[PDB]
């Protein structure tokens with residue numbers, strides 16, 4: 521399924537951090553593009569931690585899901601690097617990076633319209649996946665990549681893409697899932713096989729919270745043990761100061777998975793705001 525890329529054609533540069541059992545780097549690809557012309561293309565290189573070769577089967581499948589479909593709001597995978605000793609994904613390098621970084625960094629510079637346009641673009645991406653019964657499983661602001669910033673000169677909106685989900689919570693050890701509360705919905709902490717299209721509506725709600733909360737991580741002051749007890753007492757996240765999306769957040773984060781609204785409904789809510 522995956523186009524193979526030589527390592528002579530890939531240079532690793534800056535570290536961009538770590539995923540779950542992965543190391544991420546900005547890189548450079550030398551390729552023949554359109555019209556036989558030669559290109560040096562900056563790419564994203566994410567490496568499965570050698571200490572965790574276990575999950576390579578999931579590691580790659582997650583990217584596979586994202587590449588069988590094509591959508592303006594989904595990050596492109598270029599292929600896999602031929603290493604033999606390493607499992608390396610070659611993907612589109614989004615210029616401005618993660619949304620959570622951008623929110624924190626630009627706390628005050630974001631009005632409600634900015635958040636709304638981004639919420640809509642994310643809902644459009646999730647609706648598209650919904651039509652294809654494609655479970656993402658790791659929706660969060662960290663995995664929202666900003667292609668372009670808003671342009672004030674032209675009054676142009678920002679544009680976002682959705683990265684691949686990574687290793688699937690169906691195989692991640694317990695300690696990781698609970699660290700991902702409240703992005704992982706309740707039913708999946710009681711049983712990871714409850715992973716379902718309804719999961720992505722809950723995580724969307726959490727991501728919406730991140731977007732109004734200017735980069736704060738919900739429940740970050742609470743440790744693993746409480747994050748479980750937070751779900752046992754069936755608590756809801758606090759209303760963000762930017763409170764125009766609090767109702768939608770709570771409707772999305774419904775402890776009953778069957779009651780969470782479809783993303784068609786969600787879009788209609790988002791569209792019905794000024």
Ligand SMILES: Nc1nc(Nc2ccc(S(N)(=O)=O)cc2)nn1C(=O)c1c(F)cccc1F
Nearest residue numbers: 536544564612613614615616617662663665683
């Ligand atoms: N595909 C992709 N592109 C980028 N671009 C990027 C990354 C970092 C920066 S910076 N200056 O550190 O803040 C700037 C641009 N990230 N990315 C990812 O999948 C990705 C992700 F989802 C989560 C975390 C890290 C990632 F790398």
